[PDB]
Amino acid sequence: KVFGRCELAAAMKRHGLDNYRGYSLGNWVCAAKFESNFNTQATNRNTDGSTDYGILQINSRWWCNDGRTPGSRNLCNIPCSALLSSDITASVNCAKKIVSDGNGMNAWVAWRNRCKGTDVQAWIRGCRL
Ligand SMILES: [Cl-]
Ligand SMILES: [Cl-]
Incomplete structure (x- = not known):
């Protein structure tokens, strides 16, 4: 499924990512x-x-x-194919573990290089949340 920007924001908010470990929803939408x-x-x-x-x-x-x-450690205890579902539950639950690994969202090099230090609030502009 290709989510709309605010559709993904709403799904991530429902699953409890908004401000999870201090990362605002715009950070998660920017990373995705x-x-x-x-x-x-x-x-x-x-x-x-x-x-x-x-x-x-x-x-x-x-x-x-x-x-x-x-070397697969399978810390989220999930087949990677389950992370491709139209339902993002498995991806969100696993991301909550990743963001807890000590490095925060720097675990996603794309977040560090393209979102960190930018106006990430812009990613949820216009969203009806
Ligand atoms: Cl390749
Ligand atoms: Cl840095």
Whole structure:
């Protein structure tokens, strides 16, 4: 599913990401824009051979099991394919674990390089929340 910007914002807010660990909803929408273009089906190989899955590009080295990543820890205890569903529940629950890993949203290099230090509130402008 390709979410609208505010449609994703509303889903993330419902699932409790708004201000989760101090990260405002605009941070999560900004990250999803640049990780997946709001597309739950997005998949992308990483340099280390793992693959990133779903709206927030959750990787198969630490977080989900894709059957083809040596060293997979599957800390979210989920097949990576479940992160591609039109329902973002699994991606949100796993992202809450990722953002708790010590590095906050710097766990997503795209957030660090494209969202951090910008006007991320702009990503929820016009949203009816
Ligand atoms: Cl590739
Ligand atoms: Cl930095």
